[PDB]
Amino acid sequence: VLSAADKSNIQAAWGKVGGHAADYGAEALERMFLSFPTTKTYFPHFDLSHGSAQVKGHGAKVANALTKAVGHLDDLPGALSELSDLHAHKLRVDPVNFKLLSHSLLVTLASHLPNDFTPAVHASLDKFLASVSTVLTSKYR
Amino acid sequence: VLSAADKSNIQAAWGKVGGHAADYGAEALERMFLSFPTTKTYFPHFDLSHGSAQVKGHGAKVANALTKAVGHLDDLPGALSELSDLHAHKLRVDPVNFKLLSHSLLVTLASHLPNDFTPAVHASLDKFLASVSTVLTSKYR
Amino acid sequence: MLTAEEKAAVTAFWGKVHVDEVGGEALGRLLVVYPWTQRFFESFGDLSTADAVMNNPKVKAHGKKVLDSFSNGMKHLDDLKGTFAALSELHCDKLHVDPENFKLLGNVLVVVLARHFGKEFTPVLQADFQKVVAGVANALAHRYH
Amino acid sequence: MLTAEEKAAVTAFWGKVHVDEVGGEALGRLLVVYPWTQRFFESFGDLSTADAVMNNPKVKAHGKKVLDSFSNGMKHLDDLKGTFAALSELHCDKLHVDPENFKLLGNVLVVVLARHFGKEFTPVLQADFQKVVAGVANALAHRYH
Numbered sequence A, B: 001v002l003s004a005a006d007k008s009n010i011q012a013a014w015g016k017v018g019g020h021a022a023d024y025g026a027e028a029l030e031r032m033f034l035s036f037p038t039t040k041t042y043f044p045h046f047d048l049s050h051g052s053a054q055v056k057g058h059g060a061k062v063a064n065a066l067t068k069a070v071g072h073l074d075d076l077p078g079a080l081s082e083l084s085d086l087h088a089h090k091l092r093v094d095p096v097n098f099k100l101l102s103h104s105l106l107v108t109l110a111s112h113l114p115n116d117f118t119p120a121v122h123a124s125l126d127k128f129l130a131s132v133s134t135v136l137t138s139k140y141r
Numbered sequence C, D: 001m002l003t004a005e006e007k008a009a010v011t012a013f014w015g016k017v018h019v020d021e022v023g024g025e026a027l028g029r030l031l032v033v034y035p036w037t038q039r040f041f042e043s044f045g046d047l048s049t050a051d052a053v054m055n056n057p058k059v060k061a062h063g064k065k066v067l068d069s070f071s072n073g074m075k076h077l078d079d080l081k082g083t084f085a086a087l088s089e090l091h092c093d094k095l096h097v098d099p100e101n102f103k104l105l106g107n108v109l110v111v112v113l114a115r116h117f118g119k120e121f122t123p124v125l126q127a128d129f130q131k132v133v134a135g136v137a138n139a140l141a142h143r144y145h
């Protein structure tokens, strides 16, 4: 449902991110956990302290998935098939927690891309993350 | 995306409305205005008291657009083309208000059709109203 | 925010509600309609389909307790925060339920009241109970504040 | 509900902030990213394009007044309810702004501060400011409760 205008804003932003993707994903996770303590209950098997190997590694996994998504903006339901099952059916992740991570991600991107994070680019990235969130919350019981 | 798995519940429940669509639309509007006062400010050209022909007439329009949506579940973006622009551009309706009208609509349907309003049909009408609301908020530029 | 008038009609109507039935159905409808809420009820056994959820005896036993708490709130409309302080502790600090779900369950309770009482659950009466569910949802979310 | 540690860190951070530069950006991004918010700002003139909004003289002056209210809030972190009492009356009783948008503007402000302050806006410090924005959004919504 995303516009061509949004897609090219998203593609350009993530292209700038480049090989920083995994580092920024780990950052976004830390900002989520510290800003929103409720989200920590999803990761009790994790050491959640700063610079932990598990948050680092999980940050890389999340960023990888967003790279995959950025490349399939015409078909997110199709491309995030296994992740939708994981998040909706198996893990039963509360949809508000997607808004929380989404916000964390935007904070991280703004922090690192201050020149390229225009109002227009901000709005397109918010729509992209809301669109991914919808797919990940689409296949519950 | 609305699931095709939901269509049979949607068409069955909504089919029970029938000649009551305009009375149920009006009721739902009234339940919205009374439970959620912030919604009244969209309608300062209305008398919003019980029995007002404006709420009656408007309740009919809402109901009738939902009826058309029920007959175009494969293409809700297309069916609601003109309503999309009106609500999102001219009217600037805050997305959260669609949730409040959607709740008001489920309350109305539960009261009037208690037997048709099963747990599964409830869930399908929730996804239907959430899909409708997505389309009507989709043109914000 | 409940006026004296809003209190008395809400209170008069409440006496009619069987809360064995209404509590079970509301908690069941929460789990069916918003299936992420099932995360918090692993230990309740089978929750796979609408029928399994609704007819689950743990779901019905737990829904009874939920509505027993609402019945308690109804008795203390001028002090919901103090009334639910123990439940806020549990839901927020022990269970970390996102507070948005407290509104959702309140809303579902309203739907169930409408289904059960139809004609009697008028627009005015429903409006009053929305103030109550708003009140309960906030009292429960207070430990986050 | 901040700790003494969080209160001191966030108040120290706020003092450094050039509000004039931040306020207008925050409100501009609000109007651009969440366009329905424009409903409340029709007296402000040209809001047609992103550059119109970002460069609108009234948007800039209003944003500064918004941040000034945060600056006051910063001095009364344990009485945000009283501090924002009249502003809650304006936003709820007169404007009827849905309270979800109080969170949205706070969140937009956080994003703007990150854009400006980069790695200095640390995960801890941003977390501290999120509790401030959560607290302020609640206090503004109080007239609804």
Ligand code: HEM
Pocket (backbone or CB within 6 Å): A039, A042, A043, A061, A062, A065, A066, A083, A086, A087, A091, A093, A097, A098, A101, A132, A133, A136
């Ligand atoms: C932008 C949205 C998100 C994306 C792209 C994403 C992506 C991923 C990926 C790639 C995995 C690993 C899957 C695998 O390789 O097996 C994963 C796992 C997981 N995710 Fe997410 N996720 C998102 C949102 C969330 C949210 C909001 C939460 C909860 C706060 C969450 C909780 C989890 C949990 C608990 C796991 C399992 C990790 C483990 O057991 O080691 N996810 N996610």
Ligand code: HEM
Pocket (backbone or CB within 6 Å): B039, B042, B043, B058, B061, B062, B065, B066, B083, B086, B087, B091, B093, B097, B098, B101, B102, B132, B133, B136
């Ligand atoms: C399920 C979602 C909704 C549907 C199906 C719907 C349907 C309609 C229809 C058919 C019209 C008349 C269009 C015309 O004259 O061309 C209309 C107008 C209007 N709608 Fe909605 N609407 C929805 C949600 C909302 C919400 C949530 C609000 C605000 C609380 C709202 C506010 C208005 C207003 C202010 C008008 C014009 C009023 C008038 O002059 O009669 N709508 N809507």
Ligand code: HEM
Pocket (backbone or CB within 6 Å): C037, C038, C040, C041, C043, C065, C066, C067, C069, C070, C087, C091, C095, C097, C101, C102, C105, C106, C136, C137, C140
């Ligand atoms: C209006 C909102 C709610 C009320 C009044 C309420 C009430 C209650 C009551 C009475 C108990 C039993 C505590 C005891 O007597 O020992 C309880 C426990 C519990 N609540 Fe709620 N509740 C609400 C919302 C929620 C929501 C939305 C969820 C999650 C989606 C939730 C999850 C739980 C869980 C997991 C337990 C413990 C269950 C067990 O393992 O025994 N509650 N609550």
Ligand code: HEM
Pocket (backbone or CB within 6 Å): D037, D038, D040, D041, D043, D062, D065, D066, D069, D070, D087, D091, D095, D097, D101, D102, D103, D105, D106, D136, D137, D140
């Ligand atoms: C963090 C949340 C918010 C804060 C701290 C805040 C702060 C303020 C303050 C301090 C004023 C008074 C300025 C003066 O006295 O001149 C004001 C006015 C106003 N606010 Fe907000 N506000 C918030 C959220 C919002 C939102 C979300 C909207 C709209 C969607 C909004 C719409 C308005 C409007 C229309 C005015 C009057 C503007 C005028 O005509 O001069 N506010 N706000």
